[PDB]
């Protein structure tokens, strides 16, 4: 149940990058995922550090993405309370 959660965050990252750049990257897979809960500020939040593979013009490439999530993941706060903060080729 955790891999499937992480996979949809990965697909979210790819969708948000595609909206931002008018690209058409196609998600293939997650190759590395780290969930990090940050307790250093007034409001709890979670960062996901994701390395994923996606096709760009029929070539598979690796990307590093950072997804900010309000609160804790299991709180399931809604899709509006997530943000792609970074997405770049490795």
């Amino acid at each position: 149940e955790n891999s499937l959660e992480i996979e949809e965050l990965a697909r979210f990252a790819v969708d948000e990058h595609n909206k931002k750049e008018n690209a058409l990257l196609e998600f293939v897979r997650v190759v590395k995922a780290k969930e990090q809960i940050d307790l250093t500020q007034e409001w709890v939040f979670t960062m996901y550090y994701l390395t994923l593979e996606a096709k760009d013009g029929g070539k598979k490439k690796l990307y590093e993405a950072k997804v900010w999530v309000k609160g804790l993941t299991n709180w399931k706060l809604g899709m509006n309370f997530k943000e792609l903060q970074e997405f770049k080729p490795v």
Side-chain angles (χ1 to χ4, degrees), residues 34-51:
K34 169 207 284 195
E35 170 185 358
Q36 179 170 268
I37 297 161
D38 188 323
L39 308 175
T40 61
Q41 300 179 0
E42 190 185 0
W43 297 91
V44 180
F45 64 97
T46 302
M47 293 298 309
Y48 283 81
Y49 302 87
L50 302 169
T51 307

Side-chain angles (χ1 to χ4, degrees), residues 31-74:
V31 323
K32 190 196 150 139
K34 169 207 284 195
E35 170 185 358
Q36 179 170 268
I37 297 161
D38 188 323
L39 308 175
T40 61
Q41 300 179 0
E42 190 185 0
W43 297 91
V44 180
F45 64 97
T46 302
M47 293 298 309
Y48 283 81
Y49 302 87
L50 302 169
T51 307
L52 56 89
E53 184 167 41
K55 313 189 73 180
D56 183 15
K59 301 232 161 68
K60 301 185 177 186
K61 290 168 172 176
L62 295 181
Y63 299 86
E64 280 175 324
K66 315 191 180 175
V67 183
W68 176 96
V69 177
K70 194 176 175 183
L72 307 179
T73 288
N74 55 310

Side-chain angles (χ1 to χ4, degrees), residues 13-31:
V14 167
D15 292 335
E16 293 292 291
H17 165 93
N18 279 344
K19 290 168 49 192
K20 167 170 38 169
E21 308 279 0
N22 270 268
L24 205 76
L25 300 193
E26 183 177 22
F27 170 82
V28 176
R29 70 181 167 102
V30 184
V31 323

